Amino acid sequence: AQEKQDFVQHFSQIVRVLTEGHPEIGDAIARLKEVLEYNAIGGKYNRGLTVVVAFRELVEKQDADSLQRAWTVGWCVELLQAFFLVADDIMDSSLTRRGQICWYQKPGVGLDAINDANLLEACIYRLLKLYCREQPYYLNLIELFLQSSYQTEIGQTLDLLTAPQDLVRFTEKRYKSIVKYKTAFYSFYLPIAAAMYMAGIDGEKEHANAKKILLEMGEFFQIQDDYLDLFGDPSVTGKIGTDIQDNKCSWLVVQCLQRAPEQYQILKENYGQKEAEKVARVKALYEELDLPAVFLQYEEDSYSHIMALIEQYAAPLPPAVFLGLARKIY
Amino acid sequence: AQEKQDFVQHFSQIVRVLTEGHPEIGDAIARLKEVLEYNAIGGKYNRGLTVVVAFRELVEKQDADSLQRAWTVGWCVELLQAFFLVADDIMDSSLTRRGQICWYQKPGVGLDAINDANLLEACIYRLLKLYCREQPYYLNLIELFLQSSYQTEIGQTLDLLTAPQDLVRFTEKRYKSIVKYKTAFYSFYLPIAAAMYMAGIDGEKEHANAKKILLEMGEFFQIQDDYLDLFGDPSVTGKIGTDIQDNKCSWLVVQCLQRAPEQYQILKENYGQKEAEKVARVKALYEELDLPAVFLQYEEDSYSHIMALIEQYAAPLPPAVFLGLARKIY
Ligand SMILES: CC(C)C1=CC2=CC(=O)[C@H]3C(C)(C)CCC[C@]3(C)C2=C(O)C1=O
Ligand SMILES: CC(C)C1=CC2=CC(=O)[C@H]3C(C)(C)CCC[C@]3(C)C2=C(O)C1=O
Ligand SMILES: CC(C)C1=CC2=CC(=O)[C@H]3C(C)(C)CCC[C@]3(C)C2=C(O)C1=O
Ligand SMILES: CC(C)C1=CC2=CC(=O)[C@H]3C(C)(C)CCC[C@]3(C)C2=C(O)C1=O
Numbered sequence: 001a002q003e004k005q006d007f008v009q010h011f012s013q014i015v016r017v018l019t020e021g022h023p024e025i026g027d028a029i030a031r032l033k034e035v036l037e038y039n040a041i042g043g044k045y046n047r048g049l050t051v052v053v054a055f056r057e058l059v060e061k062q063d064a065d066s067l068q069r070a071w072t073v074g075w076c077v078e079l080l081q082a083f084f085l086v087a088d089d090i091m092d093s094s095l096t097r098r099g100q101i102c103w104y105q106k107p108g109v110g111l112d113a114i115n116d117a118n119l120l121e122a123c124i125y126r127l128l129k130l131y132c133r134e135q136p137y138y139l140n141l142i143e144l145f146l147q148s149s150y151q152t153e154i155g156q157t158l159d160l161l162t163a164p165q166d167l168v169r170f171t172e173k174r175y176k177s178i179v180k181y182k183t184a185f186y187s188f189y190l191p192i193a194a195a196m197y198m199a200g201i202d203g204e205k206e207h208a209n210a211k212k213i214l215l216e217m218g219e220f221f222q223i224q225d226d227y228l229d230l231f232g233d234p235s236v237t238g239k240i241g242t243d244i245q246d247n248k249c250s251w252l253v254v255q256c257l258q259r260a261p262e263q264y265q266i267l268k269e270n271y272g273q274k275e276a277e278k279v280a281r282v283k284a285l286y287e288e289l290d291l292p293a294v295f296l297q298y299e300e301d302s303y304s305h306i307m308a309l310i311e312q313y314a315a316p317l318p319p320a321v322f323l324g325l326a327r328k329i330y
Numbered sequence: 331a332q333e334k335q336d337f338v339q340h341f342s343q344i345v346r347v348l349t350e351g352h353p354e355i356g357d358a359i360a361r362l363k364e365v366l367e368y369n370a371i372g373g374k375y376n377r378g379l380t381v382v383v384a385f386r387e388l389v390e391k392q393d394a395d396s397l398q399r400a401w402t403v404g405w406c407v408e409l410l411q412a413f414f415l416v417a418d419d420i421m422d423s424s425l426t427r428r429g430q431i432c433w434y435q436k437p438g439v440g441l442d443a444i445n446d447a448n449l450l451e452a453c454i455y456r457l458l459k460l461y462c463r464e465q466p467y468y469l470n471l472i473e474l475f476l477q478s479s480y481q482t483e484i485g486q487t488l489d490l491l492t493a494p495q496d497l498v499r500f501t502e503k504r505y506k507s508i509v510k511y512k513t514a515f516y517s518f519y520l521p522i523a524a525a526m527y528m529a530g531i532d533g534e535k536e537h538a539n540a541k542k543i544l545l546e547m548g549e550f551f552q553i554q555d556d557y558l559d560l561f562g563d564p565s566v567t568g569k570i571g572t573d574i575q576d577n578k579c580s581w582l583v584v585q586c587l588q589r590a591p592e593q594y595q596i597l598k599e600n601y602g603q604k605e606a607e608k609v610a611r612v613k614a615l616y617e618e619l620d621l622p623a624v625f626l627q628y629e630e631d632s633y634s635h636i637m638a639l640i641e642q643y644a645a646p647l648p649p650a651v652f653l654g655l656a657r658k659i660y
Contacts, residue, residue: 024507028487115486122480150452156445157358177354
């Protein structure tokens with residue numbers, strides 16, 4: 001609830017600590033400052049918070065220090081996210097994000113944002129070392145952040161092969177595979193995995209078990225994001241949807257294609273152009289195949305299945321850690 | 331000499347090992363394959379080799395495995411270098427490199443190269459873990475590669491502030507500071523530092539001492555690169571120079587500015603435009619201030635000073651490790 005406020009207030013310190021007794025390079029550190037402030041503030045903080053919330057839920061040993069290390073690693077997750085978005089926005093030619101102008105679209109930034117994004121990545125490891133250098137799960141954390149990065153990158157590769165800016169490539173299997181690698185791992189496993197390691201919980205099986213739960217949650221959450229992109233109330237969301245315009249391998253086109261011949265063709269002409277003549281065409285076709293109802297039915301089945309997953313795979317972790325996230329996404 | 335051949339022949343295995351039993355994502359792994367092959371082969375391999383050469387020189391315990399770990403970490407250095415160049419080329423709008431067409435200029439790559447470059451970064455840590463996960467200097471290696479990345483990025487930031495694509499900013503202090511961070515750390519300290527850790531040599535002081543030697547060597551080597559850019563025989567080099575065209579904070583303009591008023595002005599009009607009317611203008615002005623002779627004299631003083639550095643800072647490491655590099659750059 002309000003806990004999010006306490007997490008954002010810790011951003012000040014994060015930036016202090018990453019910005020300093022070699023004065024040769026101050027101009028660069030100022031620039032880093034600006035990059036962090038533009039690019040790590042603005043969102044909803046759910047992934048960073050998840051680290052903190054999951055840490056409280058998972059430990060007994062909660063000294064002022066122990067906590068600080070939590071809001072730091074949370075901020076690391078946020079930093080990894082900023083690195084990806086800054087880079088994704090360039091790769092996509094996006095205009096806005098959070099809706100401010102994308103960092104790279106700022107006059108005088110342009111493609112320098114590639115280096116800025118790499119700096120954001122690097123700040124992860126500077127933080128870990130600053131706060132996470134004496135603890136025993138230090139190495140475990142570094143490895144997790146690196147593995148999460150790699151997965152996310154592989155997924156982005158997959159995405160960019162699948163959806164260069166042709167519908168044979170939009171399969172279920174491809175779609176699930178993009179979501180798992182591009183989104184689910186860093187969005188759902190990373191934050192909890194990280195709380196796990198902070199809380200002493202380092203076993204392969206526990207992590208695997210948690211992984212199984214969290215990737216499925218990830219899958220649903222991105223499917224819901226795709227549904228809501230088109231059929232969400234724009235002011236319950238704070239957006240209007242452009243998945244269709246952008247030739248995106250959305251879950252709605254996967255399912256539409258599974259249920260199309262002369263509607264295949266109708267999708268050819270209208271998926272991935274810019275005027276709401278042609279967005280209207282597909283939306284309305286989605287309505288005609290009852291994708292909303294397919295979605296309702298998926299959300300019901302998917303929830304059933306997450307709960308079965310929790311019953312089965314959670315112990316000896318507190319089910320609450322997984323149920324907290326579930327309540328929030330569903 | 332020929333040892334370089336044995337290092338390149340180990341690239342095959344490197345790629346094998348980074349390219350595989352999750353078939354959902356093969357299209358992505360193929361793409362990684364292509365990125366590695368285009369972007370890590372082509373250069374002169376000096377930094378990767380330096381790891382291997384320095385490892386042999388520094389250890390007694392050289393089993394088939396011990397060696398393999400050397401040519402791997404060498405390849406890691408090469409991978410870090412590829413990551414930087416791919417990204418630098420985009421940031422610069424370069425046309426060629428190694429002179430093949432820059433990766434990003436390939437039809438169908440474009441700004442997807444940003445993700446490709448991140449993949450190259452990630453492959454560093456995948457390799458370390460594959461070969462460097464049981465050894466005791468594992469963590470030490472990860473930290474070194476991360477620190478080297480950060481330094482290089484900070485330097486690139488500095489460079490991009492200094493030389494956006496105005497001469498008040500071209501100072502000596504700024505120039506030395508760009509070179510140290512952008513070039514010298516990853517080019518000269520990383521490879522040797524890395525051999526050091528592989529060879530058990532992990533003390534703060536030894537590394538600091540080696541650092542002191544190697545950064546100075548780095549400084550000279552980039553100064554020589556700047557001199558040779560304009561005044562090198564183009565066919566002893568395999569290039570012709572465009573430092574001037576590109577508004578670069580070269581060492582030649584630093585020194586030119588230190589020795590200019592109505593020649594300051596003459597530098598204003600002619601530094602950073604594209605026709606060899608105006609490159610001729612500055613070159614010839616460099617000749618008139620005897621920058622070649624200033625350079626000769628610097629190279630003499632700089633060599634004197636490296637040797638003093640070695641005499642003083644090398645022990646208990648074999649001076650040869652530093653002298654080998656010196657002979658080669660000077
Ligand atoms: C940095 C910022 C824009 C930011 C973006 C977010 C993108 C999402 O996909 C969000 C939703 C999942 C739709 C809802 C909340 C969490 C996500 C991941 C999110 C942020 O938390 C966020 O700070
Ligand atoms: C500030 C408070 C209302 C609050 C709202 C949230 C909105 C959501 O939609 C939840 C989801 C994005 C669906 C899942 C993550 C948590 C979200 C963002 C959420 C909060 O945590 C939250 O505290
Ligand atoms: C990947 C490839 C182009 C590559 C580029 C190199 C750039 C340099 O600055 C080279 C010089 C220092 C001028 C001479 C040899 C070493 C350098 C760093 C170098 C490579 O080894 C190299 O493979
Ligand atoms: C293949 C052999 C001749 C060989 C040539 C080299 C050329 C050089 O200019 C040396 C410098 C780039 C100046 C310093 C690094 C080593 C260089 C590239 C070098 C070799 O190591 C080398 O084996």
